[PDB]
Amino acid sequence: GYDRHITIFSPEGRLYQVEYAFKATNQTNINSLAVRGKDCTVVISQKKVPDKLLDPTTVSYIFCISRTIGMVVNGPIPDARNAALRAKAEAAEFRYKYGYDMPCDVLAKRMANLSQIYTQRAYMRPLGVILTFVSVDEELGPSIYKTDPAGYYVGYKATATGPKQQEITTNLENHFKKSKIDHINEESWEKVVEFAITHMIDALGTEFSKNDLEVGVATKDKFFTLSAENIEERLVAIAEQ
Amino acid sequence: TGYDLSNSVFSPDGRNFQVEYAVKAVENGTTSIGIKCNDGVVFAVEKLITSKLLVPQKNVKIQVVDRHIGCVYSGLIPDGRHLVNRGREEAASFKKLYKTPIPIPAFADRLGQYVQAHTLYNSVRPFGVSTIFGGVDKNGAHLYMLEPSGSYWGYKGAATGKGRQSAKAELEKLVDHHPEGLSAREAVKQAAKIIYLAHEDNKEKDFELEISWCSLSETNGLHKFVKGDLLQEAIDFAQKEIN
Amino acid sequence: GSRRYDSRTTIFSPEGRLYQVEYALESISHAGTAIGIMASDGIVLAAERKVTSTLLEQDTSTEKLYKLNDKIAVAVAGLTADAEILINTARIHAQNYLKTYNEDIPVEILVRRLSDIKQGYTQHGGLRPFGVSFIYAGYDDRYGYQLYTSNPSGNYTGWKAISVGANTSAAQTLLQMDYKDDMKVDDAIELALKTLSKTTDSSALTYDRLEFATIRKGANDGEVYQKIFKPQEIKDILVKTGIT
Amino acid sequence: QFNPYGDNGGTILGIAGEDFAVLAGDTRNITDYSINSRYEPKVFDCGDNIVMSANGFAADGDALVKRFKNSVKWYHFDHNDKKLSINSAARNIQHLLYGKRFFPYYVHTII
Amino acid sequence: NNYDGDTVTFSPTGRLFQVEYALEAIKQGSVTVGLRSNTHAVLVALKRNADELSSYQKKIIKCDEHMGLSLAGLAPDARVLSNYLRQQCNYSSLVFNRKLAVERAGHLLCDKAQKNTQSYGGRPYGVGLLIIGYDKSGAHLLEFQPSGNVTELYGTAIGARSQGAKTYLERTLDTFIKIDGNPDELIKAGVEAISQSLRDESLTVDNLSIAIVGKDTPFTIYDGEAVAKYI
Amino acid sequence: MTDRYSFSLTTFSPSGKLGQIDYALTAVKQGVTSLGIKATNGVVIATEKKSSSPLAMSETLSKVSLLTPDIGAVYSGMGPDYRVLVDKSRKVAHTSYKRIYGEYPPTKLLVSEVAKIMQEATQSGGVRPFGVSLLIAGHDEFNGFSLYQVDPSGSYFPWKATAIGKGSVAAKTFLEKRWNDELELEDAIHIALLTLKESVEGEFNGDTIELAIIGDENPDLLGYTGIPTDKGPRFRKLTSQEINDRLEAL
Amino acid sequence: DRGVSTFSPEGRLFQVEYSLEAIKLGSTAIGIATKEGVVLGVEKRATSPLLESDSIEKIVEIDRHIGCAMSGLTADARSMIEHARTAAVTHNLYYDEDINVESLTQSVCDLALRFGELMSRPFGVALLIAGHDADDGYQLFHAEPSGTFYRYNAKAIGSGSEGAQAELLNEWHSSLTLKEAELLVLKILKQVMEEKLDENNAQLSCITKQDGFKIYDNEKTAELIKELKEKEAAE
Amino acid sequence: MDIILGIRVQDSVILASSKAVTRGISVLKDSDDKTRQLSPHTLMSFAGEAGDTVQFAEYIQANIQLYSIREDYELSPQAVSSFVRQELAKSIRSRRPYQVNVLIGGYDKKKNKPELYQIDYLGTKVELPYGAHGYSGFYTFSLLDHHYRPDMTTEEGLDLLKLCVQELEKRMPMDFKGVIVKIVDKDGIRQVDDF
Amino acid sequence: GYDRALSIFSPDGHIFQVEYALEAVKRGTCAVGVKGKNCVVLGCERRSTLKLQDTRITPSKVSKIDSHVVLSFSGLNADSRILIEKARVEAQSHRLTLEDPVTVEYLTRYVAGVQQRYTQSGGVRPFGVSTLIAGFDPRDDEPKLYQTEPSGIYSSWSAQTIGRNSKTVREFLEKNYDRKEPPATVEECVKLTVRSLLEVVQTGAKNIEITVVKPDSDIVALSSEEINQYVTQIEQEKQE
Ligand SMILES: [Cl-]
Ligand SMILES: [Mg+2]
Secondary structure (H helix, E strand, O other): OOOHOOOOOHHHHHHOHHHHHHHHHHOOOEEEEEEEEOOOOOEEEEEOOOOOOOOOHHHOOEEOOOOOEEEEOOOOOOHHHHHHHHHHHHHHHHHHHHOOOOOOHHHHHHHHHHHHHHHEEOOOOOOOOEEEEEEEEOOOOEEEEEEEOOOOOOEEEEEEEEOHHHHHHHHHHHHHHHHHHOOOOOOOHHHHHHHHHHHHHHOOOOOOOOOOOOEEEEEEEEEEEEEEEHHHHHHHHHHHH | OOOOOOOOOOOOOOOOHHHHHHHHHHOOOOEEEEEEEOEEEEEEEEEEEOOEEEEEOOOOEEEEOOOOOOEEEEEOHEEEEHHHHHHHHHHHHHHHOOOOOOOOOHHHHHHHHHHHHOOOOEEOOOOEEEEEEEEOOOOOEEEEOOOOOOEEEOEEEEOOOOOOHHHHHHHHHHHHOOOOOOHHHHHHHHEEEHHHHHHHHHOOOOOOOOOEEEOOOOOOOHHHHEHHHHHHHHHHHHHHHHE | OOHHHHOOOOOOOOOOOOOHHHHHHHOOOOOOOOOOOEEEEEEEEEEEOOOOOOOEEOOOOOEEEEEEOOEEEEEEEOOOHHHHHHHHHHHHHHHHHHHHHOOOOOOOHHHHHHHHHHHHHHHOOOOOOOOOOEEEEEEOOOOOOEEEEEEEOEEEEOOOEEEOOOHHHHHHHHHHHHHOOOOOHHHHHHHHHHHHHOOOOOOOHHHHEEEEEEEEEEOOOOEEEEEEEHHHHHHHHHHHHOOO | OOOOOOOOOOOOEEEOOOOEEEEOOOOEEEEEEEEEEOOOOEEOOOOOOOOOEEEOOHHHHHHHHHHHHHHHHHHHHHHOOOOHHHHHHHHHHHHHHHHHOOOOOEEEEEO | OOOOOOOOOOOOOOHHHHHHHHHHHHHHOOEEEEEEEOEEEEEEOOOOOOOEEEEOOEEEEEEEEOEEEEEEEEEHHHHHHHHHHHHHHHHHHHHOOOOOOHHHHHHHHHHHHHHHHHEEEEEEEEEEEEEEEEEOOEEEEEOOOOOOOEEEEEEEEEEOHHHHHHHHHHHHHHOOOOOOHHHHHHHHHHHHHHHHHHOOOOOOOOOOOEEEEEEEEEEEOOHHHHHHOOO | OOOOOEEEEEEEEOOOOOOHHHHHHHHHOOOEEEEEEEEOEEEEEEOOOOOOOOOOOOOOOOEEEEEOOOOEEEEOOHHHHHHHHHHHHHHHHHHHHHHHHOOOHHHHHHEEEEHHHHHHHHHHOOOOOOOOEEEEEEEOOOEEEEEEEEEEOOOOOOOOOEEEOOHHHHHHHHHHOOOOOOOOOHHHHHHHHHHHHHOOOHHHHHHOOEEEOOOOHHHHHOOOOOOOOOOOOOOEEEHHHHHHHHHHHH | OOOOOOOOOOOOOOHHHHHHHHHHEEEOOOEEEEEOOOOEEOOOOOOOOOOOOOHOOOOOEOOOOOEEEEEEEEHHHHHHHHHHHHHHHHHHHHOOOOOOOOHHHHHHHHOOOOOOOEEEEOOOOOEEEEEOOOOOOEEEEEOOOOOOOEEEOEEOOOOHHHHHHHHHHHOOOOOOOHHHHHHHHHHHHHHHOOOOOOOOEEEEEEEEEEEEEOOOHHHHHHHHHHHHHHHOOOO | OOOOOEEEEEEEEEEEEEEEEEOOOOEEEEOOOOEEEOOOOEEEEEOOOHHHHHHHHHHHHHHHHHHHHHHHHOOOOHHHHHHHHHHHHHHOOOOOOOOOOEEEEEEEEEEEEOOOOOOOOOOEEEEOOEEEHHHHHHHHHHHHHHHHHOOOHHHHHHHHHHHHHHHHHHHHHHHHEEEEEEEOOOOEEEEEEOO | OOOOOOOOOOOOOOEEEHHHHHHHHHHHOEEEEOOOOOOOOEEEEEOOOOOOOHHHHHOOOEEEOOOOEEEEEEEEEHHHHHHHHHHHHHHHHHHHHHHOOOOOHHHHHHHHHEEEOOOOOOOOOOOEEEEEEEOOOOOOOOEEEEEEEOOOOOOOOEEEEOOOOOOOOHHHHHHHHHOOOOOOOOOHHHHHHHHHHHHHOOOOOOOEEEEEOOOOOOEEEEEEHHHHHHHHHHHEEEEE
């Protein structure tokens, strides 16, 4: 059964290598979440540092692709960094060739097309990662676009990724049923981060310290990650309410 | 099955068994460590004296990259040399274009991406080494450890090889007992002790100690080998602690 | 490495056969039958479309019969997509010859080159062969009217009447029975249709499941005309011979 | 425009006896009207009892001698330390020189 | 078993079987011995013949005036590697007017052998080499294995029954290391060392091959009647 | 390193089957139902927008794609394979035609170029076939309106009307009853919506249905005025609101 | 399947070892080196009586001072001979001299291992390269597809090799004349050959310093065959 | 090289080509045949740059002979001339173009008609009743305009050709050492030995 | 490029791909070559399961490589065209550089070398073809007949056959062909060639092709009636 080793069709029209790449996604056992505000897009991810000898500042699955675009990865770090470096190069080249900053959705498509090539061409394996791209696009506004090893991609009102993704997904679905809108109706990004953390706490059922989380925030003309103290300040605000 | 016969093939778990098999070659190799300190890093390695016929001090395993980065590894020694040769090419092209010497995090990703590239195709074999490396740059001291998968992180202390668990346990005690920091000269002495303690897991053949270090104050930010009086002082410190 | 997954398309069996060529021929044996009949004053090409659907657009469709130049046409049996690759190559080859020598390409030369391409895919490159058999119908001033066939092996032969695709065994027996050398085009038209009508796997032979073409000297004085039959023209010729 | 050649002057002289041979050359190296060196040798022992000089443009002369010395070395490796005969050396040098027929070594060579 | 089809495949215990099989070709090869003092370095090689009508396979190759090796295993692979060493030694001379350090010679061989163990299609070198040389830091002896591993030693031996000579040198270490300014005595110690690997056969005139390099001695090989002194 | 897969991954089996093409067709069978109907004065192509999640914005994912101003495409099977085919199809329309002749290719020839690309994935080294079937609707001056189906093999067939994917067998039978040669475009849109309701299970509205037409020229969608010969694209994607209007009088 | 350049567990290249089996199936070729010259002789082995035996070219000139006899898949030898001839002539062009027999053999043996995944497989032919040069005199070399070559005083290759080699072991001494060596090749060929030895199914050749490499006529070999039979009957 | 002429009459094509090969101030040869038989009924004469002429002629000859063997069929003079023109048309935009002018005289066996083609080094082809390359044309064209008739015999064509050679021998600056004359007709190619 | 080593050695020292190519030759229609005192004759079988053929345009079994050399074959027909084309190109190239047509030996040696190259080149399979190459060297009246095979070996033959049932016709030729006295005339040589094919063929109608080659580029193919006369004459003498 060599049709399960390379990316060719099985008798039932399936690509097993692609399906097994999807299972590599959860190998880190980390859950991510992304939501949109009025002016911003917030992404949050669990941060697990098991080894005491690790330098916790270097342990990260969130990446600054360009000034405007941020990317969080669900999957092993080597493939995550492979994807990040390529996305950075693609975003830079786009700006040089076409004279404007690469949009979040266009980068997502480009990376998705690359992923598609690995599902069709035999010598290249799929990357075992799910890439969630976030920005505040100058045309489309707050944006979340997500790519997988199949080469599939789509925009999102909000999204979640990881082992307990379904619990987070339904938690967010129920909120948007209630609020009757496509986003978090909130002025400051600080409170959108608070929303994101609060709803992750409810869905996963765990409490978070400052070092258990990792936060990325996209605003107009910049994407940035929060420090431990920025998150701690944010956790204190949730607790006092 | 047959998922483990070819590199870059995902198993039904989502694993690349060929990379995990390369890790076994690393686990088989001699012990090597890295200790981050106040203003730099210290590297040390176990050299098994196979025979009396081995010339002492003349089978050097620790390698320098550029002038400010030290690299040490455990597993297939030739694979480690190939990786350093690439590292030197990467560091040379960085300095050529950007003038400044390559930063350690920048350098770490250059090796990471190259090792990760050897998990993408069935026409190449994964690297049979875990590489501990680091140095001093504009932002201070950095220690890294890189694995056959291309996975790397920053470390306070790092260890790999046959005596990795013994060394890790000893490293964890140093991190706990010295929260404010460990000095460069202390780290050299501790490195010696930890190699001697980690030698208990490889005690058939007796061994030769080799240490190197980068420190902003002690070596002026450059990579140097610990030799002569400072080496013997570290050996004596290690000898006193085992007894 | 990649050796593991190589089918080895260009090798011999222990018996001295080319596996892939033999299996490509097996593929072609399920394709709709195509018949060529060469008369003294023209050539007929007849072909059966593969199980037609009632909602298929019949008039603006081309599956079996293709034009290579003004003097040469081909009937296809096998994978259409593969045939189109080869047809465009053959079309280009004909124009290269015309550009070079200022003369229309002799039929055999075009056939040989197309057959040499197929041969290449069986001897080198490690690729699968083209799953296609052609019937070439054409005219030149050296040999006059000519019928050829080529198959995935790259071997070609000349014929007075020939069939490719499905039920060739039965079709060839029927052609061998009723064919004679002093035959006219209009008689060959009738023979072609009668043969398909008996060898068809369908219940009854109808206009919508046929492609038809003639190459006559029926133009005005010493010149050749290609006629790719329209749906209504096939309907009329089918009534005229008394099949429907 | 860049001129890749120059004239370093000097002169050389070879004479052959019955059981010996001499190859002489002055030690002066010049450019235009200046003296570069009063002692810059240009007659070299190349091994196998072969002496050589390539006078004219010194850079091309040094390059040629360097290549022939290296040619002698590889002749030993490839042919079981066989002594390179003077006639065989000569023919080898022809191929070195002619190899640059369309960008010549500006030298008069004597062995 | 299932992991020895090519060099690109690791076994479940982390072994490279094609490299190990290449290592096996060395064990089948005829014995050769290396040893050095502070002033000189010596290679001693037992040559092998096909039969009495054949010549004895030449084991020792010269790389430069100051460096050379002895081989054990596939002789054509030794020819490729020795040729590479000749070029590297020669590059160092032409470009830098510098004799190639014996340590760098080893590093270059290691890296060349390694590339063949990590790529599909190729194969490991099927030969082991003992490189001797005299450079700016005195006399040297190296042991090359086609895994890539190169090792600097006082003395060693490779080939069939090389453990006999290797044990002898391990005992004699303190004696032969101090044979300074005496070529013939250092060779004698090497000839006595290789004699510990002999079974049924003894050292004859067209069987023994000796090479030496040192302080005021270019790399020179002795065969035939020139080695009759040491029998 | 390097692509060592220089050999065919699709080969003939002893029975004469091309396994990978058959298996690609099986992947198309699993795919969501899409259809196309040709009218006298237009063509309609339609499909269901299968949403992966309710949090996902299905507007951002376009199953019906403009290839040229007068040609549109829809698919059934693997979405990523379709997306790259659309990219290549758009580009080939320029490189192999518009940059030569100064005008857009006719439907049949663009279809032929797409078919060629899909055939090469069936024979070239180190690749699998595309896991999609396309329905390409288009108009050109000399051929008028046309509708084509393109399969993983690279074979293409012109259709009066057809369906592909999940419930294609039932959908084709439905279309055979309703189709005639005198259908106006609005009648074809009506039948398309009826046919598609059979295969769709969940919600059936303008937000879950994607539908486009090849009809009259749209000067309002051109973007400029002044050139009389340039009259605008015949391809138009129906809006969510425009679909719901026709679902009331269903 | 498996790689072309793969090692066996015993430390040998599979393909090289399999090519050696092909060489054992080949027709017998014998070479004997003396101080008066080197003799080369081969079994022609015509597959049918209708085949014109004089067209069987298994002994071949490389240069005036170097000859060559082959055994195994003889079609594979053509490109080896072509390379040898070019190497010999090219060296004469570059150095105005004859090329050493050993250096020629080494150049041929460099082709041997240039196979893998360069050509697709090793050569299926062994060569006996006989010649003369001023330095090492009369020489005989056995060049294998392993890339290895041994110098020999005498050597047999092909199907009757192990039986002929044992015979050459006893018969060869350092004072053999050329005439003695010619008869010895004919004697040993007649022993190991299936069909009865004559001038048509066996061929002799030699290389001497004075006359260079010469293939013998069927008339000349026939007289040596007749001389051989008389000498064996004489005791 | 220098003088090549061609005359197409009723039933044949006649090619006259100068015998002199000059380099510098020396006539090296006075019996040179500046022509190659491309096929049994097709002859090509040539003139131009030294070396290029023969190299080109023989290259064309080899290609036509290869075609003949492959198809067991003689290419028509028109077909050969078109092939030759295309080769020159490629050549002119090459790194180093063939500087060769040719006349192609052939008898088409299918049409039963003689044909004369004039092709210059640029790839400029024309079918003509009479043709010339180089300075020859400046005398012969006007002479043939006057004396040529389309229905002439081969013998009349040879007298007409004698008239051209006489004029060239009178008014040309260089000594071209007479001409080799060859006739191409239904029976193939033959050389006139006494001219 | 496709690199795979398809022709490789097996444990017993055989190259199976080359040997399987010989099986393709054994499947092919029979071809025979007989050389007389002043001529060579090439006889060829044509299988009679193919009726409704057009013999005018169907590729002939004997091919001219030059005006003085011919090539017949047994095995894969498509493969033979590639060898014939290369041989024809080399024939013209030889005339161009040497100013002399090829010898029959040289042309054979070239074709055989091409066949050999395809037995140790990566990505290719051997030619499933054996050839009989016959003719007369330039300015020479001695007949030449050579054989080649997929492995690349070649040799000269007084008479030889290849293809299916070739072992039967080789048996016939081995007793009927006298080396001391070959067929003195054209008629004798053609008759012996036709006789040898009649051991295998079936009927002597449109199943036998005969091509006679004589010195100085004198090659002619016999027609049906001309061959049928030999068939009629042989059968009447047989009934005895
Ligand atoms: Cl893209
Ligand atoms: Mg002109």
